[PDB]
Design a protein around this nucleic acid. Structure first.
Lengths: 104, 78, 91, 94, 93, 104, 80, 95
DNA sequence: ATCAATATCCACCTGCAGATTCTACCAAAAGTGTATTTGGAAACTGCTCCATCAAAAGGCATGTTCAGCTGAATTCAGCTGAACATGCCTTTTGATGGAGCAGTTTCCAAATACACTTTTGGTAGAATCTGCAGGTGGATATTGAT
DNA sequence: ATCAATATCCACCTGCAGATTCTACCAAAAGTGTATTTGGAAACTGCTCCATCAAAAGGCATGTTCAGCTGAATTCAGCTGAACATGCCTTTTGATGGAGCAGTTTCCAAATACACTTTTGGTAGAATCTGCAGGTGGATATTGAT
């Protein structure tokens, strides 16, 4: 009967609604707000996780590790633009050698 | 102890950073620079620390400072 | 004592059921969900505060999300946002 | 091997890897040392020294990326302090 | 519509530091969005500090730490000076 | 019958500041000390700019401070400039400086 | 309204650059600068307008432009 | 006057001054045009168009300051598209 | 261009240790259900503020001209950084011990919140004041060719 | 080295448009007195955090040798700045209509505020598995020489 399943999510609408008033973002939270927010986090979450597991699996292995996350974020134009000022610890950088440094 | 930062480890960095040929005077520049970077993160962290009346500086403190410098860091807290 | 790790694993097991996740990696995912949480919500609060309403509705989270997510990510984000609010209005 | 190519094969050796490249210890004492100028008797979570490391290095690979562009831009192939100081004023640190 | 502003105060302060001198309109505007920007920086940081250290009340102690966080060097020093002396000269009824 | 600004010897409003503090939702409870301190820090900073500004006004020939005078005052104080490092001052212009190399 | 971007003249650009402390300006600088200026505006306004039509308004206010500018981190005093 | 010096006392002519340097009108027409790709029938406060002016000009003066540095760095004295392209990738505007 | 010797990888194999996942519990959230409250949505309407338009004026953009000086390309030498191989030492690590302190509870004194009732401080024009924009004219530096 | 050819100041004036001051409410602090949380203030777990030790390891410090690349200086061609006449369109000033911002009232649809009623999520063991570390063996991929 929980409201996450009532909106067909797998992130918690409750825990989110709570975090929302208990942060002081205003004094009153619409009943829609935590639903929606719960959703956007679930969508974005799946988008990274998918690009990630794809990277892991392309790279030999059954599970996603910080390398797979950093790969997934830095190859998608948009996710990378969202996470442009975030460091993924344990993640390394993407391969890039300037054309000029190349032989002959 | 800043000299504990070796020239082969700097050049490992720069190599990951995609550098092919590295001057000599790069090393004491990089040392100057790293020192500065730390000084600013740490100052902010330690401030967060002794706001909490602590004598131990936590990771999360370092996380917060990093978020204020705009160098946000995932995988320890936020 | 809490985290989102459980949920990130549910969703993972939607998009890649055969696939799993390192610990340090799950950590990366968690501080991520909180970074985005905080970003959207803050922007919602500014929007409440600017337009002088003391209540944050799904509408704020929507405008916030069109403000903060770049390009097509905002499009789909707004989609599954409103879809979950509608399929919530029903039950 | 010709001057130039162990460099390049280093570049891809270290780019596929996510290893911290400063040694954990000397780093740790630099951290502690700098700290000691802000508060005394200070004690660090092992993880804080770690996060500081991931941060500082990540930052340094970044600065080396830009500084690399400043050099490539300026006819050259070999990075110099003028390169780092440009990247730092354009980035607006200085 | 009461258009609230700091303009009275910014002019008071002005006539402390330069009694013979005045200020443009556009200049006064600059001054106001400045006072609000600094307000926000300080207050926000104070509030995050609240949330971090799990206290639901913002005291002067936060405004202080926040101020040492945002103001660089000797400006933070003197800001903390006159913050603390104004609270102490306030406690005295 | 005694005001709180005059109670701390400020000339920024402690009351009105305390209000703004509760009506922003920075938290649910604002200590009686907080708004005092803040009121002060804003009065101080205000005074520091206004000071450098009026100085800029008089050697820039004039009786009142204008955006040009403010922008001068801030971009010449190291600290103020770095506080206001990402702020645009409308109608303030740029500080004068020509690269060494471009000179005859 | 069509292709008004070219109203941004090569002498006004060269005034900017002169304020910018530039002494010698290439030719291809001008439409690069046009590219950049258009991009910049496109971003500010996209956000601005969004702030407008969150307020259910058909008039885009100064304060909206202020807010987007604050979000881009290009803070602006004196209209705010 | 030899090429180089009108440039220089232009530089200081315009640095001591706080006038907007793009003309108010063509500008306003560009603003209006770009906006109309996001919403239509949109009407602008005159001050909004003003702020947009002040901002985008300040941004462009800045980008020219940096670009000036990139050219000076690269042997040169004369600013070119690759320079702006650098300043913007380092600034991390388009990376 | 290939040639063959180096050195570098990569693929494919493999047993097992360290994680990760999976399960079993209950304190702790989230959901229910009810009775109040309250913002902000609905619905006029008062009035700025914006969009045109016009008209007259110059203020600037254009186009052109043309020569200098700057960017681009080469040349070249010396010297700096890469590469490599050596011998040593600083780091790594792997538990173990001792203990400084984060982290939790249990209360309450002190601090803050309410809810109206008082008592000004601050805003909006209206009534005054006076720097300053714009205009001039030789003084005062800059700049440039012989 | 100097003037002339120019451009810039700096001083000197004035009526105005724009601060500055004055006035009059009005909405917001301030005052009072119960009505509460809250965050210390002690008292104490259980934990990370130091601090060693001690090997053993690899990672660094050094020095040599030298190729390749960084700078300096040249040369030239073209391209950008300076200069000016042409005439255009942006700018100013004032009027005109009206669109769509704002302000207020009215008052439910929506959210809050408790007190239980259920159920979820987190901790800490319980139960597999995914990589790791290590190993030839085959081409890769360079490298200098016919």
């Amino acid at each position: 009967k929980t409201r996450s399943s009532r909106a067909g999510l797998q992130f918690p609408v409750g825990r989110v609604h709570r975090l929302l008033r208990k942060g002081n973002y205003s004094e009153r939270v619409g009943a829609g707000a935590p639903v929606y927010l719960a959703a956007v986090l679930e969508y974005l979450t799946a988008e990274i996780l998918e690009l990630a597991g794809n990277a892991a699996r392309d790279n030999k292995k059954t599970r996603i590790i910080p390398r797979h996350l950093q790969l997934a974020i830095r190859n998608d134009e948009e996710l990378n633009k969202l996470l442009g000022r975030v460091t993924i610890a344990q993640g390394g950088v993407l391969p890039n050698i300037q054309a000029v440094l190349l032989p002959k | 102890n800043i000299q504990g930062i070796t020239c082969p480890a700097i050049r490992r960095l720069a190599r990951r950073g995609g550098v092919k040929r590295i001057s000599g005077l790069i090393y004491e520049e990089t040392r100057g620079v790293l020192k500065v970077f730390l000084e600013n993160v740490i100052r902010d962290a330690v401030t967060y620390t002794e706001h909490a009346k602590r004598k131990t500086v936590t990771a999360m403190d370092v996380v917060y400072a990093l978020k204020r410098q705009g160098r946000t860091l995932y995988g320890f807290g936020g | 004592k809490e985290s989102y790790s459980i949920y990130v694993y549910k969703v993972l097991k939607q998009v890649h059921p055969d696939t799993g996740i390192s610990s340090k990696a799950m950590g990366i995912m968690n501080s991520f969900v909180n970074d985005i949480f905080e970003r959207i919500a803050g922007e919602a609060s500014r929007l409440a505060h600017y337009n002088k309403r003391s209540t944050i509705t799904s509408r704020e989270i929507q405008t916030a999300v069109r403000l903060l997510l770049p390009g097509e990510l905002a499009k789909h984000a707004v989609s599954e946002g409103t879809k979950a609010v509608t399929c919530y209005t029903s039950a | 091997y010709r001057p130039g190519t162990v460099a390049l094969r280093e570049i891809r050796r270290y780019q596929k890897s996510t290893e911290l490249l400063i040694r954990k210890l000397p780093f740790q004492r630099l951290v502690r040392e700098i700290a000691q100028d802000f508060k005394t008797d200070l004690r660090f979570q092992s993880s804080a020294v770690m996060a500081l490391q991931e941060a500082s290095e990540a930052y340094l690979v970044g600065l080396f990326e830009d500084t690399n562009l400043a050099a490539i831009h300026a006819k050259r192939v070999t990075i110099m302090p003028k390169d780092i100081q440009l990247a730092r004023r354009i980035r607006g640190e200085r």
